[PDB]
Design a protein around this ligand. Sequence first.
Ligand SMILES: Nc1ncnc2c1ncn2[C@@H]1O[C@H](COP(=O)(O)OP(=O)(O)OP(=O)(O)O)[C@@H](O)[C@H]1O
Ligand SMILES: [Ca+2]
Ligand SMILES: [Mg+2]
Lengths: 368, 126
Amino acid sequence: DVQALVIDNGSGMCKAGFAGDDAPRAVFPSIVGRPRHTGMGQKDSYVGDEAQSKRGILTLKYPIEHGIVTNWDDMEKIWHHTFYNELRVAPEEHPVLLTEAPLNPKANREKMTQIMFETFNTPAMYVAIQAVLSLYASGRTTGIVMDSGDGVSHTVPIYEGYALPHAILRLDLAGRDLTDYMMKILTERGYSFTTTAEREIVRDIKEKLAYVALDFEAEMQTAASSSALEKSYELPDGQVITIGNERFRCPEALFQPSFLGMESAGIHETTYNSIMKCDVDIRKDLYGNVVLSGGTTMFPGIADRMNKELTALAPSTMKIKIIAPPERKYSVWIGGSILASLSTFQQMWISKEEYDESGPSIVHRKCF
Amino acid sequence: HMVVEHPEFLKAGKEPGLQIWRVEKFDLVPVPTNLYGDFFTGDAYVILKTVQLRNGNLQYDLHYWLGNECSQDESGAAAIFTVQLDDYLNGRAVQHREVQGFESATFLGYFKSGLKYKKGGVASGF
Ligand SMILES: Nc1ncnc2c1ncn2[C@@H]1O[C@H](COP(=O)(O)OP(=O)(O)OP(=O)(O)O)[C@@H](O)[C@H]1O
Ligand SMILES: [Ca+2]
Ligand SMILES: [Mg+2]
């Protein structure tokens, strides 16, 4: 019958597709480009891959920061592009499930809702918390999700299907900061990567060669003592460069934010702190269900390291289990695809009729 | 403008006893009563145990059982339907995740002769 759409609007990458598919059809940068100078390249705006590719003649804007929309005109351009160009749908024909960051401001949830109904004329819509979707994708109703993407890392305790907002914490460090840090430490070796194409190289080095050391001190010592940890990387121009301790120093910043001159506790402590903000009677179930999600959780070794660090923080009789699904870059989107497909979800959406009667604030009563 | 209309929810937890549904392509489908306790390892199920309390109110334990080979749409749906059923039952149900081979004593105790596993199951909805 009616085909729902699922859009996960990330700060760095939008993931969009059709409910019931196992993966998003479209994954593209959350970027809007406009003519840089007000004097071809000639359209009013570009979005996604095309905007990034035409950056030489466009000024680029990233309307989502820490998962929160900061520019609604640009966000509307991204959604229009998503519907008409990426998914090739008429949005007036489809219920739309959208995702939101933990603790998304009230006014923002209302604005999302107003735009869908008034700008796009969606027949129905729903807004889900990203972390809760990841937990569902892992087949659980209780656990703590550590969601680390582009600008922010959140720890979100969830009990019997619902986030505990009083216990949600955040570390203001995620993948873009790790890319920037890799850029900085690679300069110590004499490699300067400063342009956009060069930053993309650095991102690829982070994604392909970095890993989380189980014992950082010991890994540094191994790296200082021999070339065993070194790896070669070929640049697009053909030059071959060598990378050593930068491989594990880069994601170490997740556990030691002082590496970036931050006073904040590392992700392991943030996770522990969130657990300790929860009712003592549910903490066992949180430690036993720590679910990693998001692109910045994709480092090899991260689950082993989280296990070690949380084990050190928790009582020795507490069972720690870190769940790190291979599909975790997409687990939010996948949780959305499942939710939107359920026979029960037709009963859950906000309908156009409901919006017409109640206005945007209906979102606080239907989606929580 | 919307009320819970899913026919199986309307049947759930009306009287003391055991009720079992299987996830089949994003829907909750009742298991024939004579097949209770025989679980396909390729599938996910939702089990509601209803017990009568002394004031005549009903006690609910909701278990979602996950076969070793069930697909992500099935285990994900089982978890979500469990939350939805608990909400439908006014939050009165304790939720239990039951993994094949690691089920709680409580869950195993529902099946007088012992539960049984069998290979196979219904196709993924993905
Ligand atoms: N294999 C990998 N190893 C390390 N980092 C990776 C890997 N793959 C992707 N990333 C990083 O993940 C980040 C993007 O993550 P994700 O797509 O989950 O963020 P987002 O959803 O756009 O942002 P947010 O949820 O923070 O709003 C990028 O910084 C990217 O470089
Ligand atoms: Ca199956
Ligand atoms: Mg994200």
